[PDB]
Design a protein around this ligand. Structure first.
Ligand code: HEC
Ligand SMILES: [Ca+2]
Ligand SMILES: [Ca+2]
Ligand SMILES: [Ca+2]
Length: 135
């Protein structure tokens, strides 16, 4: 399926600037997502908290908002609770703590940029991306 440049263009930070991933960067981000993120976020969902999925509306409500690439990169370095108060660096996988997340130890900052871009392109691609799982 061909993905155009507009689809691969997503917010870079909060003030209106955007970034466009290459096809290669998209591919790499998708691959990392499948290998490392789908154990807890299949289809962009979250099941152990409400409204803290990878869907855009949920990301937008985080503190600071996570619906832009740089905020996602920051989260994957130094994860926090949704209100930003609590340090999740020993709770959520991240590249700061390869000692406890060895599956993260070979990803560079640029790899994390690619999965962050992937995460924000994915909802454009799939109406079912994101959401809270309820039982
Ligand atoms: C289970 C072992 C997880 C793995 C692997 C990954 N994530 Fe995760 N993530 C998980 C939980 C339980 C939560 C909720 C935290 C909370 O505040 O209760 C999250 C949350 C995120 C978020 C924030 C979503 C928001 O709407 O603010 C992001 C951006 C996120 N996780 C990303 C992410 C990525 C890209 C991962 C692969 C590198 C990844 N997570 C793995 C649990 C788990
Ligand atoms: Ca894996
Ligand atoms: Ca809650
Ligand atoms: Ca792996």
């Amino acid at each position: 399926v061909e993905l155009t440049e507009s689809t691969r263009t997503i917010p870079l930070d909060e003030a209106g600037g955007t970034t466009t991933l290459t096809a290669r960067q998209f591919t790499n981000g998708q691959k990392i997502f499948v290998d490392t993120c789908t154990q807890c976020h299949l289809q962009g969902k979250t099941k152990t908290n409400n409204n803290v999925s990878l869907g855009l509306a949920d990301l937008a409500g985080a503190e600071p908002r996570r619906d832009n690439v740089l905020a996602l990169v920051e989260f994957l370095k130094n994860p926090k609770s949704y209100d930003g108060e609590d340090d999740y660096s020993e709770l959520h996988p991240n590249i700061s703590r390869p000692d406890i997340y060895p599956e993260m130890r070979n990803y560079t900052e640029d790899d994390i940029f690619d999965v962050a871009g992937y995460t924000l392109i994915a909802p454009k691609l799939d109406e079912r991306w994101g959401g809270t799982i309820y039982f």
